[PDB]
């Protein structure tokens, strides 16, 4: 029988995730039976169906009443309570909560779902404090089925970590720096306005906006040999989706661009198939909407100096690709459910 899933937070990730599940529903061990969100079912149904980035959902009918949303005649119960302690998880027999609000990323925060009755939580963001973090294709097999709260990290860490692993195994990464040139996200204001972070306050579609990021350090969680060896920053720019990681590493074994490319091409066809895609095409951000890989290496941009300083560039669809990984991680947990 199925693992019973509720989505907490029906936002860009919550709705991308839902759309990913609807496309892969026939082979799945997950059944999405509930959603909680600030908004009501009719608003959620409307936004699930009409998406400025994904287009109109055509695969099946989407409908709503006061209580439920219906996707292809699958009924999903809706509730709207900002306090996860109050949610009907025991009553709905919820096994796994997908925590996509961006608000309950600490153990104590996420545990509120457990005390409301869910058996496990998968947080769609980096965890705060001691929360086991997974990137599919890198360390997802180390998942321990006894764990009640996990994190699927960030979009950026999902893009960077698999490249780093391949490069580390082939060349030995000593140190590395990252910049993600990233689409704007919903934590940025539309026009200049009040915000705790003075950069996130500024008009998102009008500016290049630097922010600090934990994404590079977080690679050290999932590749423990590299802990404390990576750092970077983010630059948000006026696109609404699709991002790119720029990674410059100091490596031990001297190499050249051709060889770096070859090694990532070989991984994309074997150990990292479905996770890293290797491309020699001269494409731009739009072309990567809806791409299922965590990282698309842009081979033409790869360069090396003095044998040891390696630059690689990898695209990622930060909403859809990441949501596909969230789903992969959930399917994995369901296949390993004690």
């Amino acid at each position: 029988s199925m693992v019973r899933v509720a989505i907490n937070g029906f936002g860009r990730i919550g709705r991308n995730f839902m759309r990913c599940w609807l496309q892969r529903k026939a082979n799945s061990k997950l059944e999405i039976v509930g959603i909680n969100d600030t908004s009501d079912p009719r608003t959620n149904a409307h936004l699930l169906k009409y998406d400025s980035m994904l287009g109109i959902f055509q695969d099946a009918e989407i409908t709503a009443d006061d209580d439920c949303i219906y996707a292809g005649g699958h009924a999903v119960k809706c509730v709207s309570d900002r306090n996860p302690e109050n949610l009907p998880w025991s009553a709905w027999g919820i096994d796994l909560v997908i925590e996509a609000t961006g608000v309950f990323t600490s153990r104590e925060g996420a545990s509120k779902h457990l005390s409301a009755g869910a058996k496990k939580v998968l947080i769609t963001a980096p965890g705060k404090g001691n929360i086991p973090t997974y990137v599919v294709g890198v360390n997802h097999h180390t998942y321990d089925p006894s764990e009640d709260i996990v994190s699927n990290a960030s979009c950026t860490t999902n893009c960077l970590a698999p490249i780093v692993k391949v490069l580390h195994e082939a060349f030995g990464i000593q140190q590395g720096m990252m910049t993600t040139t990233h689409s704007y996200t919903g934590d940025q204001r539309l026009l200049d306005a009040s915000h705790r972070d003075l950069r996130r306050a500024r008009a998102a579609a009008m500016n290049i906006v630097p922010t600090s990021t934990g994404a590079a350090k977080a690679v050290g969680l999932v590749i423990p040999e590299l802990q404390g060896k990576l750092n970077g920053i983010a630059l948000r720019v006026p696109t609404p989706n699709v991002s790119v990681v720029d990674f410059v590493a100091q490596v031990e074994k001297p190499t050249i661009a051709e060889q770096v490319n070859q090694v990532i091409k070989e991984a994309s066809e074997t150990t990292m198939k479905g996770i890293i895609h290797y491309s020699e095409l001269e494409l731009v951000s739009s072309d990567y909407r809806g791409h299922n890989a965590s990282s698309i290496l842009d081979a033409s941009l790869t360069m090396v100096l003095g044998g040891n300083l390696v630059k690689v560039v990898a695209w990622y669809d930060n909403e859809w690709g990441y949501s596909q990984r969230v789903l992969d991680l959930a399917e994995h947990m369901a296949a390993h459910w004690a």
């Binding site: 609000t101 961006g102 608000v103 934590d187 009040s194 915000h195 705790r196 972070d197």
Partner: peptide, 21 residues
Amino acid sequence: TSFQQYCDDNPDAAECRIYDD
């Protein structure tokens, strides 16, 4: 100070959201 309090109480509010891109 009342602002820090407001973001503790309401971390999903527009003034408060911090997403780790």
